[PDB]
UniProtKB/TrEMBL annotation, chain F:
This is Spike protein S2'.
């Protein structure tokens, strides 16, 4: 910016390595020297994908008979299957579908180790009682979602023509659940744990007969003694049954085999892209790398082989082969710059020139912009390493000189 | 008698190995810290992006940034300490020669 | 529900002789972590040729566990009689995080026939039977070991060729020597080798059928079987429970000779298992053909950090329990089985509480009466009750109203009703429910801007 | 390489410029330290080392074999990872990591680079060899 | 509507749920021992 | 732990962790600076003796 | 001693291993410094 504010000169900081240098010092004039700059990135040349492909995950149970009350929720656990939430959601009039610790787009598109679906009858009038922040009876004694795993909650109404789902007489819930200790002075509220059933489930009937019913069980000594007690409550039934569906997903306890179905191209196979840098998504595991055919190590049944820094370093494919996985590797870059001549050369340290006058292979890497001179110096200003030096022609190209 | 002296009982020899080990330790900080999540759901930025929307995605990426910026500051601080020490030591070597 | 075959039609159970003295043996086989005993392999992945620490459910180094041994029943020559068992059905344990079992460790050694201490025989592997569930209590005569509601039963059958897992309600039968009948001692399973273990056709329901003599199986939700190839190889079995169900682990399908356990099944058991017991088993052998059966050992699991040595082939052959002792802590901190000589600081030996002391204000109830009398104020004229030096009970107040929406901020729900405070301030007012959202922190409407705002 | 991250990284200021400049200076410091140290070991005048140097005093241990015998032994007995200055990039792809926690191959993965020293081995050997020959005189 | 605001340390935290006390939770009876404590809302571990 | 549930409890514990990890890193950095200084000083003491 | 904290601490990597190793080395340094210093103050011959 000039004094009058106009821009008269600029550097595109991603144009080349010399430009990166000027930008890092925020100046158009930097001192002579050899500087490290951002590496020349390897970029993906394609992608490989492997997903479980097969059986649909089965939501049929859900659709047949009278759903349980909130404290007796039923659980469907899906593993090793193709899921489709639209397939289930489309059967209900959804009133409220929200997600936590997972985006909306993600719930319907990511692969999981497992998907757990908890379904139950639930009045919509008590919607708020399922909130994480709630201190009412549902969240304290009946049903609580995980705080650790990503979850979604769907509240939906059963359509008049979905005749396979029947209604209970009333909606019901536990409004009290507690233990009376052996002294019969102290009463301890028994709160429901996330993803678990309340201890009072065994004393509370599948339908509370009437609001205010009190239940009691004498506990054995192995259960700590005393009494387990509970109180039920009811909500009048609606014209259409309202149901809640909790969804909990886990991301890495097993192969993430619960995936949306995918139509596979045969150009996304690993064997067809060996040696290339590709993006990968293997049963929910993703990143970038290069696959190589190699000797199997690790336990085959476990599929993914990890190193001591927890990187994925190998994989057993469903095509029967074991592949080594290497990172797409970046190519080191150092800029050799001479301020007086306004010239430069690029050193790719540690890199053979097969990956890059043409390029010159030197003891410290591959260098472009230098010409081999078979000349010696003592007075080296731009040392390259080992006993090599860049020597400006003064302008011409820099010479590669040896230090005497 | 010294030809067979580069062993476990040679203090000067261990100092040579230790200088080598110190270089390795300096590099191990960078190699080992990228696997940490620093409270994030994943050490992978790609996993964060794939799973979360921007208002939460941001917070998770930011945890990884803070952890990595911290790691690099620690690394640099040590390279400066180690290079200062080596430079003083080099002047001692100069005097001994 | 699942059809699990017909009910037993017998009017009586076989009499069970419980003589614990005969089973009070000392044959210790504690977990040797350095030999990787009891280890469940990290589940979602493998490693090769590395040493790393890992957090997971492991048995403790040195844990002796609980030894159980099955025996031959009583006989007279060629006619087997009464069953002979240990007091196992009444010995109910807390499940906690699950357990691992060492099975057949003594196989091929010369052992004892438990029922006849002077009789020796080659030891053969036998599989453990388990009963697991959410609630326990007693039977009709007061003996313990009854499980209520759905109970998970892991019952090996077919003379050791299958594992049968089922989740069902066990209804005690009322016949002679049965749990709801007369002269009951303990239920037990059995098989009769003479008719059940023919060289060709093994009776795959022999143990199920004996189980059924003591209980009627009702509302079974599942019954699964797993096949076991016969051998005399030491194997490990394990059980854990998560939100996904009960996980059954075994070494025999992946690392038969090595011993690492891998998951082979998940059962749709979602209620929490709190209790378990060993179902005693007695073999109705003839007197002339009694065998020594190997003892099995049950070890409890807990969330421990182990140093795990993964071989090139990925199996764990060696490990360190990082909390066992100070030397183990050292190895774990360097993530190595070999550390240099020296003097090192390690975690301190913690003092642990030996009890607790509590002092609370005890006295007057905090008084919510004002709240209940007369016309409540409008939202901008809310009234405030400040409670100090009193015993509070929110249920006492909440129970008087039909609560439509109760939420908390910067305090948990459990905490609001259970913690002590310097003060509790209660602001009450008339408020239409139709304007519920106007009380939200994020609201920019008239209530939050001009009438009432929370801290 | 993730753009969202880079976008957030920018809000921390010129963080990476500081990292690079601090290390650049720290690295120049060794080239200057080495240059100064060797300038001082350097002899003005020296006698040639010939086999037999030392007379009755057995100095074969120190004579160049070129590094001396003790010098090669010193290096052979110290476990040092090979940084691959000429083609390490490729060694780590065609062979892969030598072992667990291979910090040389980690360079191309983690984003760090080990730079070569100011002088090659034969030059350093030349300095100490000329030094040996200067001692008596 | 009922708003509830709670404060945790301006005074002795004397607004507590009622508790039935055992006499083995007294301080005098456990002197010299490491115990957990909860004294008018103040808690931790220590030796009295 | 006594006051908050996991999604918020975590954030609060994490603040304490970050502060304590920072403190320990600062401590260690200084013990290394101070021990390096003392070691140089010890060699000065050696020369003076 | 709080398990929840320890669980979260683990996500920061082997933090404590680094603290312990750094101090262990720093502490060895003084034992070596002292040993070397006294080895040099030590006399070969001395009068009473
Ligand atoms: C996850 O789960 C969800 C839910 O299960 C899946 O989403 C469904 O996907 C299917 C496709 O696989 C999709 O079917 C499509 O429906 C449209 C809509 O047509 C309806 O209305 C027209 C009005 O004119 C009617 O004529 C027609 O018959 C349909 O009527 C329906 O409703 C009436 C009552 O009102 C009933 O009486 C009817 O029986 C019927 O139920 C169709 O137009 C569409 O047809 C095209 O594809 C089929 C493929 O078989 C092809 O045969 C047709 O000729 C036509 O294809 C031509 O046109 C397309 C462009 O549209 C072009 O690409 C082709 O090349 C051809 O030129 C088809 O039947 C269903 O609606 C989706 N449902 C929901 C809720 O989303 C989702 O796919 C799953 N995900 C995964 C990964 O599996
Ligand atoms: C915080 O504030 C809350 C709210 O104020 C406190 O919670 C209350 O705690 C009391 C106990 O202190 C609890 O009372 C118990 O109620 C049950 C329910 O019985 C009702 O239904 C049965 C149906 O068969 C009726 O028969 C019975 O009369 C009750 O009917 C009520 O409603 C009808 C209208 O429908 C009215 O007409 C009635 O008058 C009545 O209002 C009782 O079963 C229970 O009884 C047991 O305890 C009493 C103690 O005095 C004892 O005398 C009884 O014999 C019986 O004890 C035996 O059984 C227990 C096991 O249950 C065993 O442990 C004993 O050893 C004996 O073997 C008692 O009356 C009330 O319901 C709670 N309310 C709420 C909303 O939670 C809370 O305690 C406070 N916290 C603190 C720390 O103080
Ligand atoms: C988890 O497991 C537990 C333990 O098994 C179950 O609790 C048992 O529940 C059953 C019933 O659900 C109890 O059995 C009997 O229930 C009768 C209910 O009476 C009504 O229904 C009967 C049906 O025929 C009608 O005839 C009657 O008119 C009523 O309409 C009680 O009346 C019975 O009482 C008898 O025993 C008592 C004992 O004191 C005597 O005082 C009575 O006079 C009479 O003889 C009996 O209670 C059974 O007792 C409960 N067991 C225990 C240990 O408490 C849980 O239900 C199960 N949970 C779930 C969710 O499935
Ligand atoms: C009671 O007695 C029985 C036998 O009477 C013992 O069973 C033997 O146990 C050993 C050790 O577990 C088994 O030996 C292992 O055999 C494996 C495969 O053997 C099969 O395949 C090879 C292939 O050449 C055949 O030669 C062999 O005959 C079998 O067909 C090997 O793979 C194992 O080697 C692996 O582990 C060793 C351990 O050091 C490594 O060194 C190897 O490199 C390799 O990793 C091993 O050799 C033996 O086969 C079992 N017998 C039977 C019949 O199966 C019971 O263990 C014993 N019970 C008790 C409690 O002691
Ligand atoms: C030994 O143990 C096994 C358990 O592993 C047990 O297996 C059960 O056998 C019964 C049959 O004896 C199976 O029940 C059948 O399953 C088929 C499945 O298609 C049904 O079609 C059959 O229905 C017909 O018969 C019914 C009999 O009442 C009629 O009511 C019905 O209307 C039909 O006519 C029937 O349900 C059962 O599923 C398996 N169970 C398992 C878990 O595999 C076996 O019976 C035991 N054997 C003995 C001798 O006890
Ligand atoms: C000056 O000193 C050097 C050593 O510093 C002497 O050379 C050494 O001579 C011995 C002979 O006893 C060699 O031993 C041989 O070692 C090999 C090792 O495999 C063994 O196979 C032979 O059987 C024998 O034991 C020793 O290696 C050799 N060392 C070197 C570096 O050459 C040298 O002779 C001395 N010169 C004079 C004039 O004394
Ligand atoms: N029917 C039957 N089943 C058996 O399992 C059985 N086992 C034995 C032998 N059991 C054992 C078990 C361990 C040791 C043993 O050598 N223990 C060591 C101590 C191990 C330790 O505590 O670390 C010892 O020296 O006693 C001996 C015999 C004998 N008869 C049997 N009979
Ligand atoms: C498993 O890891 C060990 C390291 O613990 C490897 O052994 C090293 O192999 C290299 C090969 O050049 C030698 O230079 C090292 O000196 C060996 N170290 C030890 C401690 O022996 C072993 O080869 C690895 N096995 C496989 C199949 O990769
Ligand atoms: C079942 O038998 C076992 C074993 O004999 C009993 O457990 C023993 O109980 C005595 C009681 O003083 C203890 O001293 C022993 O140390 C216990 N043994 C073991 C191995 O722990 C058990 O209590 C009996 N259970 C029932 C219900 O009768
Ligand atoms: C176990 O299954 C039975 C049948 O599927 C359930 O239903 C009862 O069956 C008995 C059979 O004699 C009938 O007399 C009852 O009237 C039936 N009750 C109902 C409500 O239909 C039984 O409820 C199931 N038990 C459990 C605990 O699920
Ligand atoms: C577990 O083992 C049983 C018994 O070997 C298998 O059942 C046999 O399957 C064959 C298949 O041709 C039949 O011919 C036999 O008649 C079956 N036997 C019986 C007793 O039914 C069973 O399939 C095996 N299970 C698995 C999962 O492999
Ligand atoms: C548990 C028990 O009572 N065991 C007794 C057995 C059985 O009565 C017979 O084996 C019946 O088949 O008989 C003994 O004489 C024996 O064999 O040593 C004494 C032994 O104490
Ligand atoms: C149910 O199906 C009948 C069939 O004619 C249709 O007329 C009716 O509108 C459908 N109802 C709903 C709610 O879709
Ligand atoms: C690869 O995909 C093409 C797409 O049409 C198909 O024609 C070809 O047969 C496929 N090859 C194999 C091996 O399936
Ligand atoms: C991988 O290598 C093995 C042997 O080294 C070979 O037989 C197999 O076919 C190769 N697989 C591929 C995909 O090239
Ligand atoms: C430069 O050319 C000379 C030819 O004499 C050759 O010996 C030397 O190795 C070359 N240097 C490089 C880096 O190629
Ligand atoms: C447990 O025992 C008591 C007396 O011993 C008896 O009254 C009670 O009914 C028993 N419980 C069961 C479930 O039979
Ligand atoms: C301590 O508690 C017991 C419990 O029954 C009681 O009997 C005893 O009198 C109490 N002691 C005092 C000093 O109150």
């Amino acid at each position: 910016f000039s004094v009058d504010g106009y821009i008269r000169r600029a550097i595109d900081c991603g144009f080349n390595d010399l430009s990166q240098l000027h930008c890092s010092y925020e100046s158009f004039d930097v001192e002579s020297g050899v500087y490290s700059v951002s590496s020349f990135e390897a970029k993906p040349s394609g992608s490989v994908v492997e997903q479980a492909e097969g059986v649909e995950c089965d939501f049929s149970p859900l659709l047949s008979g009278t759903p349980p009350q909130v404290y007796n929720f039923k659980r469907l656990v899906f593993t090793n299957c193709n899921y489709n939430l639209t397939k289930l959601l489309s059967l209900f009039s959804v009133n409220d579908f929200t997600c936590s610790q997972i985006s909306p787009a993600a719930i319907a598109s990511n692969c999981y180790s497992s998907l757990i679906l908890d379904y139950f009858s639930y009045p919509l009038s008590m919607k708020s009682d399922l909130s994480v922040s709630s201190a009412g009876p549902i969240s304290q004694f009946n049903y609580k979602q995980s705080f650790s795993n990503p979850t979604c909650l769907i509240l939906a109404t059963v359509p008049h023509n979905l005749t396979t789902i029947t209604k209970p007489l009333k909606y019901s819930y536990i409004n009290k659940c507690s233990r009376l200790l052996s002294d019969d002075r102290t009463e301890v509220p028994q709160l429901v744990n996330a993803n678990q059933y309340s201890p009072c489930v065994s004393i509370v009937p599948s339908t509370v007969w009437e609001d205010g019913d009190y239940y009691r069980k004498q506990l054995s000594p192995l259960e700590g003694g005393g009494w387990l007690v509970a109180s039920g409550s009811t909500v009048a039934m609606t014209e259409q049954l309202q149901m809640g569906f909790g969804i909990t997903v886990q991301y890495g306890t097993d192969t993430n085999s619960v995936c949306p179905k995918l139509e596979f191209a045969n150009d996304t196979k690993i064997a067809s892209q060996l040696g290339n840098c590709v993006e990968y998504s293997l049963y929910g595991v993703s990143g970038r790398g290069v696959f190589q055919n190699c000797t199997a190590v690790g336990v085959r049944q476990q599929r993914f082989v990890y190193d001591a820094y927890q990187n994925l370093v190998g994989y057993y494919s469903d095509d029967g082969n074991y592949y080594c996985l290497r990172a797409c590797v970046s190519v080191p870059v150092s800029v050799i710059y001479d301020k007086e001549t306004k010239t430069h050369a690029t050193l790719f340290g540690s890199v053979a020139c097969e990956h890059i006058y043409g390029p010159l292979q030197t003891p410290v890497g591959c260098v472009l912009g230098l010409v081999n001179s078979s000349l010696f110096v003592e007075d080296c200003k731009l040392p390259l390493g080992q006993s090599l030096c860049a020597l400006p022609d003064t302008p011409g190209e820099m010479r590669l000189a040896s230090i005497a | 008698a010294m030809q067979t002296g580069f062993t476990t009982t040679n203090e000067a020899f261990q100092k040579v190995q230790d200088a080598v080990n110190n270089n390795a330790q300096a590099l191990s900080k960078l190699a080992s810290e990228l696997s940490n999540t620093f409270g994030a759901i994943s050490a992978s930025i790609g996993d964060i992006i794939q799973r979360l929307d921007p208002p939460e995605q941001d917070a998770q990426i930011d945890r990884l940034i803070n952890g990595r910026l911290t790691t690099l500051n620690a690394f640099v601080a040590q390279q400066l300490v180690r290079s200062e020490s080596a430079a003083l030591s080099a002047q001692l070597a100069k005097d001994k020669v | 529900t699942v059809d699990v075959g017909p009910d037993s039609v017998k009017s009586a159970c076989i009499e069970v002789d419980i003589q614990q003295t005969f089973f009070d043996k000392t044959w210790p086989r504690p977990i040797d972590v350095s030999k990787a005993d009891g280890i469940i392999y990290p589940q979602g992945r493998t490693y090769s040729n590395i040493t790393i620490t890992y957090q997971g459910l492991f048995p403790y180094q040195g844990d002796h566990g609980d030894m159980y041994v099955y025996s031959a029943g009583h006989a007279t020559g060629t006619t087997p009689q009464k069953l002979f068992v240990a007091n196992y059905s009444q010995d109910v344990k807390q499940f906690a995080n699950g357990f691992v079992v060492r099975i057949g460790a003594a196989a091929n050694s010369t052992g004892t026939v438990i029922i006849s201490p002077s009789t020796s025989a080659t030891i053969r592997k036998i599989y453990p039977a388990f009963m697991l569930g959410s609630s326990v209590g007693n039977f009709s005569d007061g003996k313990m070991g009854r499980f209520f509601n759905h109970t998970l039963v892991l019952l090996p059958d077919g003379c050791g060729t299958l594992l049968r897992a089922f989740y069902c309600i066990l209804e005690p039968r009322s016949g002679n020597h049965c749990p709801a009948g007369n002269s009951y001692t303990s239920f037990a399973t059995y098989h009769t080798p003479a008719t059940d273990c023919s060289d060709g056709n093994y009776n795959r329901n022999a143990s199920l059928n004996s189980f059924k003599e003591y209980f009627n199986l009702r509302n079974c939700t599942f019954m699964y079987t797993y096949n076991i190839t016969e051998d005399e190889i030491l194997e490990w079995f394990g059980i854990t429970q998560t939100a996904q169900g009960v996980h059954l682990f075994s070494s025999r399908y992946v690392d038969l000779y090595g011993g690492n356990m891998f998951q082979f099944a998940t059962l749709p058991v979602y209620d929490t298992i709190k209790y378990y017991s060993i179902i005693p088993h007695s073999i109705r052998s003839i007197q002339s053909d009694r065998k020594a059966w190997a003892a099995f050992y049950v070890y409890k699991l807990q969330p421990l950090t182990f140093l795990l040595d993964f071989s090139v082939d990925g199996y764990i052959r060696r490990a360190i329990d990082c909390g066992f002792n100070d030397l183990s802590q050292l190895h774990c901190s360097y993530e190595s089985f070999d550390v240099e000589s020296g003097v090192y600081s390690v975690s301190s030996f913690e003092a642990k509480p030996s009890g607790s002391v509590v002092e609370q204000a005890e006295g007057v109830e905090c008084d919510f009466s004002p709240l209940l009398s007369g016309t409540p104020p409008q939202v901008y004229n809310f009234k405030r009750l400040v409670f100090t030096n009193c015993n509070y009970n929110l249920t006492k107040l909440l129970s008087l109203f039909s609560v439509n929406d109760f939420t908390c901020s910067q305090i948990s729900p459990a905490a609001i009703a259970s913690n002590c405070y310097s003060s509790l301030i209660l602001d009450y007012f008339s408020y239409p429910l139709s304007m519920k959202s106007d009380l939200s922190v994020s609201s920019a409407g008239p209530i939050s801007q001009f009438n009432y705002k929370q801290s | 390489g993730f753009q969202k991250c880079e976008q957030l990284l920018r809000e921390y200021g010129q963080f990476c410029s500081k990292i690079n400049q601090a290390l650049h200076g720290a690295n120049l410091r060794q080239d200057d330290s080495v240059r100064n140290l060797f300038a001082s070991v350097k002899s003005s005048q020296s006698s040639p080392i010939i086999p037999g140097f030392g007379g009755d005093f057995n100095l074969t241990l120190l004579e160049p074999v070129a590094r001396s015998a003790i010098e090669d032994l010193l290096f052979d007995k110290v476990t040092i990872a090979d940084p691959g200055y000429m083609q390490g990039y490729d060694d780590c792809m065609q062979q892969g990591p030598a072992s667990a926690r291979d910090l040389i191959c980690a360079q191309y993965v983690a984003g760090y680079k080990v730079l070569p020293p100011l002088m090659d081995v034969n030059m350093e050997a030349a300095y100490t060899s000329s030094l040996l020959g200067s001692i008596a005189g």
